[PDB]
Design a protein around this nucleic acid. Structure first.
Lengths: 45, 123, 80, 157, 205, 82, 129
RNA sequence: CCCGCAGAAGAAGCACCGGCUAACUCCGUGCCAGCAGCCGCGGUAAUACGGAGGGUGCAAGCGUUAAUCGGAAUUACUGGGCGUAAAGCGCACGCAGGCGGUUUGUUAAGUCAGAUGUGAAAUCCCCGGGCUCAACCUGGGAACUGCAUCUGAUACUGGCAA
RNA sequence: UAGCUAGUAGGUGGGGUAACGGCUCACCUAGGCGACGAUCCCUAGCUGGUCUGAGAGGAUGACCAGCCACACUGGAACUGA
């Protein structure tokens, strides 16, 4: 199925417009433990 | 406070508006469904969520989420719309009833198949 | 005894007729405070035997105009 | 016959130079089941070492309550710091139906069938100080006939 | 309506002999009681304060064999009755017809007496009644029709009740198989271990 | 014309009539002046089959009230010696 | 601006009970003596005296039981912004019978339990708990 | 409705199982597919996805959606607040309004007590009765918090006089 | 939504209705309503009730019954108690 992208009416490049689109934003994950790992309640209980 | 001040302007009841403007308290609405697509969610989730815009039969033009795995909608495919936001996509306040008027049930559910519109398997 | 209401005249000058405010002392439904509310009535009399701003005595009768279904009984405590 | 009981355990922090050091705070309420309550807060580095530290505090902090043999005397209010607790004698109102952390102290109190409601805040540490404020602020016709009327048969009726 | 699944499994969720299977044999230990209601039975539950109220409501339902929408109509009737609600509740359950047939001695279990009521075999006050939820008033007699009298099942179940408590609130002849429901039962008699304290509180939230 | 007629309340296949005084130009269950008894045709061999306030029915006949043929037959059932 | 003199009587009692004062003096009035005669006869106040010739100044000697205030609390109910009139069956009861509620009835000022026995209500005044 | 006939014979689903909230493990998949009421799950050892075994809940129903009230003391009369959290007009004078010190008299308007007329029936509640029981139908009572009238009571409030 | 009102507000007299009446007409007085919300705009059949809530309230008024209203749209009368 289709994808409703950000950049309305992409002209030239058909692949370097989507690279800035939030489909290809940088997925950064969370640490544990690690500079930024506070729980407050974890996955269970 | 001050019971004399409640005689001039009475203690006015707070009005709460409806989350789903689906035309005045009806459970489902049938929709004409132009423009089926996918959209990326808001910040923490990062999936590719399937969602269709829908021309409702009264005049409203709403977008509506399509639950379940795999669908057969295409660019008209007149379907049925129930309420309920998805909290994850911006502007989506509805779901589609899987198993109603064009939107077939999910392939090979075994658990929780009233939702997602799948008949009980004969075998 | 006939049923009858005290009152006080608002305005005289309408020619053998007179308008009377009747103050009724009614409790508010929810809040329980007593509110001084007013019932204005067009009241029939003869020509000018009562004036503006004075206590009055009124009884209910047959209609006499598009309003003015009440009638003077007597005039107590005339306008000073 | 001592009937010790737990209500809530919480994890608190201290946040020191290296990381942060956690510790656990219990909240227990004991009571004989007849007119006596008592609560102790208790806290330690580890969870079971906090609760038995909280039980021993609850035994030495007991309050006497005079009750009508299964219930309260009169509708008493219990304000303490967040908690506008109302609790009503409910003359065989059939069952301790009170809110969370307020149901806990009252079932070990000895009362069986009162009504109640917590207003305002609902912090378990405060609402259990709130109802034990109310059960101390309640007085019996054995006591109010020592001040006013001076006759238990004339004070009540 | 009825449960009719495995019924000695319903005991192990309580750990309590709910007298469901028990019947002809004596003391069972034939299910690993107190131990394993399923796959994860050997684990101990924390059983929060909602769980101690629900598992006491389900126990009183699974004893008398009453579903929820009917058990909620007993409670809604027990609240409007004069007096104690948890004692009005057990009086309505103990006064059911299939309960009275069980208490007289007719039927080894309660589900047997439910079938023995349902199949037109129980004659209460000179009339035949299908409904196991028939509410037996005090000073009523209740017996067996001779079409189903001494039919090899009521005979065995009657002698089996000689080893039981022999309840106070009813007399039964058991040779003529006609027992008189004397009075409504009192809470001091009936079993003293079901905690109706909790059932009144669960419907209030 | 006022009339003393029945009303047909009750359930399905279990009729229960309210002998009642009403204007003629109203419905059977419609606006009535005063209820003046009841009639249970399927009652039992029991205590009560029919009450009928005859002091009001004599009062309304004295005003000139007609009586429908069932209600007139029920006065022939609640007789001076029956 | 001296709107309710009767609530001024009651707030001098709580502030007397709180401050452990021996006695509390106030301007006297006809209605003050009626309410204080109730509290004397009911057991909340010892020995009111109304010593005053042209400026009548009544004093209420307060009552203390252990080292403790006898009056638990006393709330002016029918304050002059909101008059509260009660019917016979509608008459309240404070602390489920063991407090009292001073009501002003057609046969004078009396307690709630005396106005049930008389069988007539009126303007309740205070809730002496 | 009753009797007789045969044959355990024709008759059990739906939701849920991380926390709230009763009920858990294995496998598959790897911020993908998906879930979701809120907080949030999924990045290779997912009790949260999907399937499986097990369990819990309700049961000829079970869930979703919608609407309403409830919880919500979250418009607070009952029953909230306003130094700093949302909130004291920048400060005054002041009409209408609201409130009003103290004693005697009279008035009885508000108030209170009683009576009478009415407040349709059904409904709701109580005690009973009838369908095998229940739902249902029904008898009697209470209620319908009210309004009008008359008879009093006079503490308090209002009027009027000192 | 701040002022609306000219048969409008009242009077006298004729007429009209089963009946009082600006209901109507001629003449005279210039009033009448309005911050206790007239006027205008939006919405809506009304009540007993129903649902909820411990209550006070809040929401609603399907079935059942009482009242009103309308009968393709707009208007008019005739007959008739």
């Amino acid at each position: 199925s289709r994808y409703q992208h950000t950049k309305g009416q992409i002209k030239d490049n058909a692949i370097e417009a989507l690279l800035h689109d939030p489909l290809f934003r940088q997925r950064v994950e969370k640490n544990k433990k690690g500079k930024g790992s506070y729980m407050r309640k974890g996955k269970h209980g | 406070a001050t019971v004399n001040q409640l005689v001039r302007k009475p203690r006015a009841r707070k009005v709460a508006k409806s989350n789903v403007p689906a035309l005045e308290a009806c459970p489902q609405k049938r929709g004409v469904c132009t423009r089926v697509y996918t959209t990326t969610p808001k910040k923490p989730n990062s999936a590719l969520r399937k969602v269709c815009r829908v021309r409702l039969t009264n005049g409203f033009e709403v977008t509506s989420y399509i639950g379940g795995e795999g669908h057969n909608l295409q660019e008209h495919s007149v379907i049925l719309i129930r309420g309920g936001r998805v909290k994850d996509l911006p502007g989506v306040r509805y779901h589609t009833v899987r198993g109603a008027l064009d939107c077939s049930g999910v392939k090979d559910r075994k658990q929780a198949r009233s939702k997602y519109g799948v008949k009980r398997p004969k075998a | 005894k006939i049923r009858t209401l005290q009152g006080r005249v608002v305005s005289d000058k309408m020619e053998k007729s007179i308008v009377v405010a009747i103050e009724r002392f009614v409790k508010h439904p929810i809040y329980g405070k007593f509110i001084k509310r007013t019932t204005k009535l067009h009241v029939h009399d003869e020509n000018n035997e009562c004036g503006i701003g004075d206590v009055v005595e009124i009884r209910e009768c047959r209609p006499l105009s598009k309003t003015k279904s009440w009638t003077l009984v007597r005039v107590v405590e005339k306008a000073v | 016959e001592l009937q010790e009981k737990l209500i809530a355990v919480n994890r608190v922090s201290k946040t020191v130079k290296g990381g942060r050091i956690f510790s656990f705070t219990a909240l227990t309420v004991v009571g004989d089941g007849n007119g006596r309550v008592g609560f102790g807060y208790g806290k330690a580095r580890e969870v079971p070492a906090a609760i038995q530290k909280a039980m021993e505090k609850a035994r030495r902090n007991m309050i006497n309550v005079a009750l009508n043999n299964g219930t309260l005397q009169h509708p008493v209010k219990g304000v303490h710091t967040g908690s506008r607790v109302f609790m009503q004698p409910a003359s065989e109102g059939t069952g301790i139906i009170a809110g969370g952390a307020m149901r806990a102290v009252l079932e070990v109190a000895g009362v069986h069938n009162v009504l109640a409601k917590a207003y305002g805040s609902t912090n378990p540490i405060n609402v259990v100080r709130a109802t034990i404020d109310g059960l101390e602020n309640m007085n019996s016709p054995e006591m109010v006939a020592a001040k006013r009327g001076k006759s238990v048969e004339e004070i009540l009726g | 309506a009825r449960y009719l699944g495995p019924k000695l499994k319903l005991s192990r969720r309580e750990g309590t002999d709910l007298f469901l299977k028990s019947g002809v044999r004596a003391i069972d230990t034939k299910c690993k009681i107190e131990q394993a209601p399923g796959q994860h039975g050997a684990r101990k539950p924390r059983l929060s304060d909602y769980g101690v109220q629900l598992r006491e409501k389900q126990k009183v339902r699974r004893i008398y064999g009453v579903l929820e929408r009917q058990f909620r109509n007993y409670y809604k009737e027990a609240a409007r009755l004069k007096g104690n609600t948890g004692e009005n509740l057990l009086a309505l359950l103990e006064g059911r017809l299939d309960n009275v047939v069980y208490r007289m001695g007719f039927g080894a279990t309660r589900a047997e007496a439910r079938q023995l009521v349902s199949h037109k075999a129980i004659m209460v006050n000179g009339r035949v009644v299908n409904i196991a939820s028939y509410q037996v008033s005090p000073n009523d007699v209740v017996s067996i029709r001779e079409k189903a009298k001494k039919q090899s099942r009521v005979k065995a179940a009657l002698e089996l009740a000689e080893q039981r408590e022999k309840p106070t609130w009813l007399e039964v002849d058991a040779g003529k198989m006609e027992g008189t429901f004397k009075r409504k039962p009192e809470r001091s008699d009936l079993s003293a271990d079901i905690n109706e304290h909790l059932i009144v509180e669960l419907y209030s939230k | 014309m006022v009339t003393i007629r029945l009303a047909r309340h009750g359930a399905k296949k279990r009729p229960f009539y309210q002998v009642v005084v009403a204007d003629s130009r109203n419905a059977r269950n419609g606006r009535f002046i005063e209820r003046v008894g009841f009639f249970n045709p399927i009652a039992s061999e029991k205590e009560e089959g029919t009450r009928l306030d005859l002091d009001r029915i004599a009062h309304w006949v004295g005003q000139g009230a007609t009586i429908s043929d069932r209600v007139a037959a029920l006065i022939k059932e609640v007789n001076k010696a029956a | 601006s001296m709107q309710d003199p009767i609530a001024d009587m009651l707030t001098r009692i709580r502030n007397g009970q709180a401050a452990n004062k021996a006695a509390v003096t106030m301007p006297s009035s006809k209605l003050k003596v009626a309410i204080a005669n109730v509290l004397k006869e009911e057991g909340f106040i010892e020995d009111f005296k109304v010593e005053g010739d042209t400026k009548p100044e009544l004093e209420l000697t307060l009552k203390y039981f252990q080292g403790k205030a006898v009056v638990e609390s006393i709330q002016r109910v029918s304050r002059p912004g909101l008059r509260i009139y009660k019917r016979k069956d509608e008459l309240p009861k404070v602390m489920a019978g063991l407090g009292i509620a001073v009501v002003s009835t057609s046969k004078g000022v009396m307690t709630d339990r005396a106005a049930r026995q008389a069988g007539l209500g009126g303007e309740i005044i205070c809730y002496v708990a």
